[PDB]
């Protein structure tokens, strides 16, 4: 049937779009884990500095 052939093609494209869109979302989730690993290193540089500052004032007797 003309209409059945057309409908079958459209359904396969719809399935492909859903599958490809899920893969995009999966890649987003994985990459966000990488951004978070790098941002954990940033927090570590920052935390080291804030601890150095705290020690400075404790030691000067200013706490």
Contact residues toward a copy of itself (CB under 8 A) are 1, 3-4, 7-8, 10-11, 13-15, 17-22, 24-25, 27-29, 31-32, 34-36, 38-39, 41-43, 45-47, 49-50, 52-54, 56-57, 59-60, 62
Q: Which one, 29 or 63, has the nearer CB to ligand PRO?
A: 29
Q: What is the 3-state secondary structure (H, E, C) of the chain?
A: CHHHHHHHHHHHHHHHHHHHHHHHHHHHHHHHHHHHHHHHHHHHHHHHHHHHHHHHHHHCCCC
Q: Shortest Cβ distance from residue 32 to ligand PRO (Å)?
A: 15
């Amino acid at each position: 049937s003309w209409e059945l052939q057309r409908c079958r093609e459209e359904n396969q494209e719809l399935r492909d779009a859903i599958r490809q869109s899920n893969q995009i979302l999966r890649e987003v989730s994985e990459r966000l884990l990488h951004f978070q690993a790098s941002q954990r290193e940033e927090k570590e540089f920052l935390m080291a500095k804030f601890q150095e500052a705290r020690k400075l004032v404790e030691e000067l007797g200013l706490v």
